[PDB]
Amino acid sequence: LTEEQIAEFKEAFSLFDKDGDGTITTKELGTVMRSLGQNPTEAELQDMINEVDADGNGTIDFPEFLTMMARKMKDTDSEEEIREAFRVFDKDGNGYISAAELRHVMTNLGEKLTDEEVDEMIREADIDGDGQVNYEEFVQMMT
Amino acid sequence: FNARRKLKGAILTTMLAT
Ligand SMILES: [Ca+2]
Ligand SMILES: [Ca+2]
Ligand SMILES: [Ca+2]
Ligand SMILES: [Ca+2]
Ligand SMILES: [Ca+2]
C-alpha cells in the first residue's frame, strides 16, 4: 500500500470523522451517508463497523479503516460504485462535473476550499483539457 | 494543498457512503 494511497485513505477518514477525535462512530457514518442522500438502518451501520472492528471497542480508528480499504468491500448488486459516486458529483446530470458542482460537494462534506483549490482539483482530473470532468476521466482517476 | 489527494479522498468517501 503506497504513500499516496495511505494519504488518500487518511483524507477519506477525515471526512467521516466529523468531530476529529480519531474514531468513526456509527453516528458519523449515518450522518455522512444521509448527507449524501442515503438512509442506512441502525443494524446496517452496526454490521458495517463490526466487519472492520478488529480490537472490538465498537469504533473504527485509522489502522482499522486502513485494513478495510486494503481488503476492499464487496459488491452485492452495485458493482459500479464509480457511476453512483459520479452521480453525487454531477448534480444536474449532464455528464460533466464543473468546478461549481465540485465546490458544492466539498461544502456538503464539510470543508471550505478556495476557488483556486477547486480549480486545481478539476485540473488534476481533467485529461482532455475542456475544464470539466466527464465520466471516463472520473473512472481513470480512480482506476 | 494536495489537489489529487483531497479530490480522491472525497470520491472515496462518497463511494463508501453509497
Ligand atoms: Ca469521531
Ligand atoms: Ca476499534
Ligand atoms: Ca454537471
Ligand atoms: Ca475534461
Ligand atoms: Ca466541456
Side-chain angles (χ1 to χ4, degrees), chain A residues 1-73 75-111 113-143, chain B:
Chain A
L1 202 60
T2 68
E3 181 262 271
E4 71 164 299
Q5 280 182 104
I6 293 170
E8 287 154 17
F9 301 158
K10 203 187 187 74
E11 191 53 57
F13 183 87
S14 290
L15 303 172
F16 287 106
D17 178 19
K18 287 207 162 298
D19 61 21
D21 75 358
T23 48
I24 301 167
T25 63
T26 48
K27 294 182 194 61
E28 291 172 317
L29 282 181
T31 295
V32 177
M33 282 180 234
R34 287 192 296 266
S35 74
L36 298 179
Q38 212 69 43
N39 235 285
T41 63
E42 74 300 294
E44 289 172 319
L45 283 167
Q46 192 57 86
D47 297 326
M48 191 173 291
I49 282 196
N50 286 152
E51 285 159 52
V52 189
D53 199 21
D55 67 87
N57 69 346
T59 60
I60 296 169
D61 54 34
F62 186 46
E64 294 171 312
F65 187 92
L66 213 59
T67 312
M68 161 185 227
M69 297 310 281
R71 188 68 172 185
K72 192 64 188 66
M73 215 301 115
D75 59 277
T76 51
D77 71 307
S78 300
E79 70 297 293
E80 235 63 70
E81 290 173 79
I82 310 299
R83 174 64 75 179
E84 299 275 64
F86 179 75
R87 268 145 60 208
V88 184
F89 287 85
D90 180 32
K91 295 196 302 95
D92 60 28
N94 76 340
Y96 296 79
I97 304 164
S98 67
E101 293 173 309
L102 183 53
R103 195 187 306 121
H104 265 246
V105 177
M106 301 307 224
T107 298
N108 190 337
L109 288 170
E111 38 177 47
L113 299 162
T114 304
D115 304 284
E116 167 62 352
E117 289 171 11
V118 179
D119 192 17
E120 285 169 89
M121 287 185 258
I122 287 298
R123 276 184 285 255
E124 284 300 309
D126 187 8
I127 293 176
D128 55 38
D130 65 10
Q132 304 201 285
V133 182
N134 65 22
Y135 185 61
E136 306 71 54
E137 294 169 336
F138 192 86
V139 178
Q140 291 298 85
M141 250 274 295
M142 304 318 297
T143 62
Chain B
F1 183 73
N2 203 272
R4 161 146 282 168
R5 269 163 266 298
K6 261 280 185 300
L7 173 58
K8 292 172 94 305
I11 295 174
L12 235 30
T13 298
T14 66
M15 260 189 265
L16 292 162
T18 68

